[PDB]
């Protein structure tokens, strides 16, 4: 697997394990019961004569021919530390989430769903939160929620609001928090926001759409009066 | 043609189950195959044997392979026993009467565990298809089904109806409401898979594929929105392997605690719960040990932390058996000894009894007290043979020879072989003749009980075939030094004759009823055909893809059968050797065939676990077994017939015996019971000043706009205008209650629009012809809350597009040349 | 502007204007979304 002529080799973590220097500068470590690449270090831009270990190739070094040294330390098990930890907190962020969707707490269940990016759950905490508020916008403690919201997470729900106003029946949820984002956030700091324009680009043609519908059933409701002035004669 | 059924079945101990035992050392219960045994463990006897009955070849017994039984559970209070089935089928079995009572098809896949609750009225199953199903005994009915897993549930533990604990293969630990059927927590075990569960008290233990053991603390009571199952600790067993399985045992007397951890090697670890006050000991000292080596008082606090695991546990004991384990139990918990009991993967039940004194035992090693051995073999035949007599069955395996009694079942004699390949019978079924890998020839007298002979170099190599002639007097035997040795019985000894050499090696050697021909397979798929009395070359067969495995030869000795690793059966006449047909008998290799006597009918059996019944003259399958659960190693047929005998890798002998409304008609319907439960609740409030709705739980208001829903769009108008005007006012007044719902108005307002605007449109000639003061007020009414959610929608979008305007507007300014 | 595919490769997004996120899938779901893709690529 290397390109260039390979000049240094050392076993490292006892027999399970070796290190190779090749000519073009690359470090490869490969497995020897399988003999493959497990992985590549690149810290040189030149050929590499010397190679040391210590504690087992716990720490490597490696001297460039233009003098450069790479200090390699092992961090596997830092690693895998730092994979289980996010895996063991996003479990808990979804564990967290339905229960509070059973529960109905939508301030809570909101929150979770921005972070966990669960497109139904934000339409569904969202909608059913939406007929409670119909049962100062949604709710003060979900209209404070929406309002600590950082930039980055913005441009997440003006997406998803783009993409509900398309659809007729999803409309109604969609300029809904988009209304409230406009009643709790400076207008100016929007609009400098990276793409957010665009995104508040396309969704104007759908509400306008939408203001020419609605407004004709209004017209066609005043049958009920027309019915009405007949009537009483 | 006849049909043959399994007369009976037996060489089973132990199958790919647990184990229950039953105080009376006590009864034990453990599985064979399809069927369940009970044993004595002080005897070593059979006591009851459970079959459902359809015995295999019959025209009713179905044409797949019997389901075997996964899991045994019993409740001794009740004396009920639960068995699960591959299949996901649970059977409730009587003890005493030893027959079914209930039948439960809910699962997709293997059962993995059963547990009865306390009570004894409900059954909590457990599958491989990652579901757990409550079932109620009295009921016989699943009461529900908890789905959140996402591979086989390991295990699970509930001993109290509120709540239960499960265990997966996937890992995650989840935490039930039983009176919610929700899943309240998640958390990950272990990396991997998680094998093991056991809860006692607070103190939780879970086992993963490696040796990391984790242990943990259940508040059920925290109801912090988490914090139900918090780890402690992490402590390490000796065995690198998985742990199959963990359970809990206390000693009344002494309320001492333990339990083990099966893993999946030959080796249980057993494990002693500390008391508080020796915990608190040992805290003490530890930190007087790490005070005196200097550290720090932090360092010892977090030091104590992470030696916490230690504190609680103490390894008492390792079990070592000579065999893998299977499964394990505890028997009996006492201060002077404590006793388990174990089945292996070999087919066999070990007793353990353990004699202790205060922390450590008496004994460096378990005693072994008793041994269930000798109605089974450990290792699996490879050929068996059957008594001219038709009395006696010889079946050789690795390391043993054991000999049965067709009419009892029971073993007669063992005798300790090598690796058994080939045996047969001598004429008066007093000797048997064995044929070992080792290249050496056996002999073994049954009155004597012991080995007359060996020959230690009959052969260079494995001696994989043997045949003996029809007057018993001469001896063939091939092996894989590509050589045919033949033999003389002078009294009794073997004396060697002459050697064939051949130029491949030797899988089988045939020699014919009329001893004219002596047939041989080669691994050059080649079959060679010759005369016994004088040894000339007579055919060379040919077709065969791969080695032929078996061979046999007609009564008449006319035809003969080849079977080969080809999943291919070749029936050739002997005059000219030529294949009368080839046939596609099995999908695996085919190990033996035999001719019935008397008859050109033969059977054939391969790695599918299929025993096929053929015509000769017809070649055709007349009849298709399936009841071995694996690989059928060996064949025999009896001298008269009767019965045919055929023992597989599953351990188990067995012996065969010769014997509508349209849109706008649903909704006229809906109208009708939705406003008739309207104006009753209407009419029951102003006197104060169904089945289908209750059934469906849903409002009167809710089933009619449902049904509105399920019309289609192009379908409304059609449907709303066979309407009468009488169905329109009771439409006029269902609009109307939803009014005050606002909640469904806003959730429909598009369709509340449409269907009841043109309704006006239709028939408005006729409704404005009525002067019912009621209904003008219904229309004023519903008129002016219309607007105001409508207007309500327009002035929320109305205003988003405006200052969004603005928005655009104000970048403009900024970003805009 | 016109919804088209999920951005991200964890979401299946329809053109009603849905986005279906995986890991909140029941596994019922899976399957029919996956036959019903199995329909539209056969006919396409």
């Known amino acids: 697997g290397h390109t260039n002529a390979v000049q240094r080799c050392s076993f490292i973590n006892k027999q399970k394990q070796l290190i190779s220097c090749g000519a073009d500068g690359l470090i490869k470590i490969w497995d020897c019961s399988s003999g493959e690449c497990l992985k590549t270090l690149d810290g040189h831009n030149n050929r590499l004569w010397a190679l040391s270990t210590m504690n087992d190739g716990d720490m490597i070094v490696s001297a460039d021919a233009d003098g450069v040294f790479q200090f390699w330390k092992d961090c596997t098990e830092q690693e895998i530390e730092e994979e289980q930890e996010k895996a063991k907190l996003q479990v808990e962020q979804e564990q967290s989430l339905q229960n509070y969707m059973s529960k109905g707490d939508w301030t809570n269940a909101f929150l979770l769903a921005m972070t966990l990016d669960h497109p139904m759950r934000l339409f569904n905490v969202l909608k059913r939160a939406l007929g409670e508020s119909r049962s100062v916008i949604f709710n003060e403690e979900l209209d404070q929620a929406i309002s600590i919201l950082n930039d980055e997470q913005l441009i997440l729900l003006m997406k998803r609001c783009r993409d509900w106003n398309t659809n007729a029946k999803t409309h109604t949820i969609a300029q809904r928090t988009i209304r409230c984002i406009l009643m709790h956030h400076n207008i100016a700091k929007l609009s400098e926001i990276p793409g957010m324009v665009k995104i508040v680009d396309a969704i104007i043609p759908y509400t306008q759409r939408h203001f020419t519908r609605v407004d004709n059933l209004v017209e066609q409701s005043y049958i009920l009066d027309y019915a009405l002035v007949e009537m009483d004669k | 043609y006849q049909r043959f059924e399994q007369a009976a079945a037996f060489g089973v101990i132990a199958s790919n189950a647990n184990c229950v035992w039953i105080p009376a050392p006590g009864q034990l219960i453990t599985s064979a195959l399809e069927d369940v045994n009970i044993w004595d463990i002080k005897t070593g006897d059979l006591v009851s044997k459970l079959s459902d009955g359809l015995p295999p070849g019959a025209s009713d017994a179905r044409g797949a392979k019997p389901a075997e039984c996964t899991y045994l559970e019993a409740h001794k209070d009740t004396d009920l026993l639960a068995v699960g089935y591959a299949d996901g089928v649970i059977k409730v079995w009587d003890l005493m009467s030893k027959t079914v009572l209930l039948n439960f098809n809910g699962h997709k896949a293997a059962i993995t565990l059963l547990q009865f609750d306390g009570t004894g009225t409900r059954l909590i199953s457990g599958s491989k298809d990652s579901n757990i199903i409550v079932w109620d005994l009295v009921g016989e009915v699943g009461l529900y089904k908890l789905r959140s897993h996402k591979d086989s549930i390991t295990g699970f533990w509930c001993q109290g109806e509120d709540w239960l604990i499960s265990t997966s293969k996937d890992g995650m630990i989840k935490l039930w409401d039983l009176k919610t059927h929700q899943c309240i927590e998640t958390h990950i075990a272990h990396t991997g898979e998680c094998w093991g569960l056991a809860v006692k008290d607070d103190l939780l233990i879970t086992t993963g594929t490696d040796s990391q053991v984790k242990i943990w603390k259940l508040d059920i009571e925290n109801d912090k929105m988490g914090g139900k199952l918090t780890e402690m600790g992490i402590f390490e067993k000796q065995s690198k392997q998985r742990g199959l399985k963990i359970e809990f045992i206390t000693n009344s007397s002494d309320k001492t605690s333990f339990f083990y951890i099966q893993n999946a090697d030959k080796t249980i670890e057993t494990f002693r719960i500390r008391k508080e006050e020796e915990i608190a000991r040992g805290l003490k000292k530890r930190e007087k040990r790490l005070k005196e080596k200097g550290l720090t008082e932090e360092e010892i606090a977090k030091s104590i932390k992470e030696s916490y695991s230690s504190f609680i546990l103490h390894p008492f004991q390792t079990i070592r058996s000579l065999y893998k384990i299977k499964s394990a139990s505890w028997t009996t918990v006492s201060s002077s000894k404590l006793e388990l009991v174990l089945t292996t993967s070999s087919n066999t039940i070990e007793y353990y009894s353990i004699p202790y004194e205060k922390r450590d035992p008496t004994s460096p090693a378990p005693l072994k007290t008793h041994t269930i051995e000798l109605q089974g073999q450990r290792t699996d035949v490879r050929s068996i043979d059957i008594s001219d007599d038709n009395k006696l069955l010889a079946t050789a395996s690795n390391g043993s020879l054991k000999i049965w009694n067709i009419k009892t079942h029971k073993c007669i004699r063992t005798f300790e072989c090598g690796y058994a390949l080939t045996c047969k019978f001598l004429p008066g079924g007093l000797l048997v003749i064995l044929g070992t890998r080792n290249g050496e020839l056996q002999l073994f007298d049954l009155a004597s009980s012991s080995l007359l002979d060996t020959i230690e170099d009959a052969h260079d190599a494995a001696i994989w075939s043997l045949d003996l002639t029809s007057d018993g007097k001469r001896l063939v035997t091939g092996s894989a030094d590509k050589t045919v040795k033949f033999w003389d019985f002078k009294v009794l000894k073997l004396h060697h004759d002459t050697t064939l050499e051949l130029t491949d090696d030797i899988l089988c050697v045939r020699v014919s009823p009329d001893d004219r021909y002596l047939a041989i397979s080669l691994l050059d798929n080649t079959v060679k055909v010759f005369f016994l009395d004088s040894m000339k070359f007579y055919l060379s067969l040919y077709g065969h893809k791969l080695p032929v495995l078996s061979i046999d030869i007609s009564f008449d000795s006319k035809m003969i059968i080849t079977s080969s690793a080809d999943k291919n059966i070749k029936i050739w006449g002997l005059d000219f050797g030529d294949c009368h047909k080839s046939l596609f008998a099995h999908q695996d290799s085919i190990m033996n065939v035999k001719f019935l006597p008397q008859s050109h009918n033969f059977f054939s059996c391969s790695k599918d676990a299929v025993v096929k019944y053929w015509d000769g003259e017809k070649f055709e399958c007349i009849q298709k077994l399936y009841a071995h659960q694996s690989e059928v190693w060996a064949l025999a047929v009896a001298t008269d017939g009767g019965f045919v005998v055929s023992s597989s890798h599953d351990h188990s002998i067995r012996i065969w015996e010769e014997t509508s409304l349209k849109a706008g008609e649903r909704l006229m319907e809906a109208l009708d019971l939705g406003i008739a439960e309207i104006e009753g609740l209407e009419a029951y409030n102003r006197d104060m000043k169904n089945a289908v709705l209750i059934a469906v739980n849903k409002t009167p208001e809710q089933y009619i706009m449902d049904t509105l829903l399920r019309i289609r769009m192009s379908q409304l108008e059609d449907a709303l205008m066979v309407m009468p005007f009488s169905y329109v006012l009771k439409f006029l007044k269902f609009i109307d209650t939803v009014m005050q719902n606002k909640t469904l108005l806003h959730s429909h307002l598009p369709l509340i629009c449409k269907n009841l605007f043109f309704i006006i449109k239709f028939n408005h000639k006729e409704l404005v012809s009525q002067k019912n003061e009621e209904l003008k007020l219904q229309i004023n009414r519903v008129k002016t809350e219309l607007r105001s959610a409508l207007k309500s929608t327009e002035d929320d979008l109305g205003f988003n597009v405006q200052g969004l305007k603005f928005v655009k507007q104000q970048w403009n300014l900024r970003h805009n040349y | ?44």
Request: charged share 50%.
């Open chain 3, 1 to 44: 502007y016109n919804v088209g595919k999920a951005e991200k490769d964890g979401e299946i997004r329809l053109k009603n204007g849905v986005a279906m996120s995986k890991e909140e899938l029941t596994r019922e779901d899976k399957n029919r979304l996956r036959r019903a893709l199995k329909r539209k690529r056969s006919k396409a």
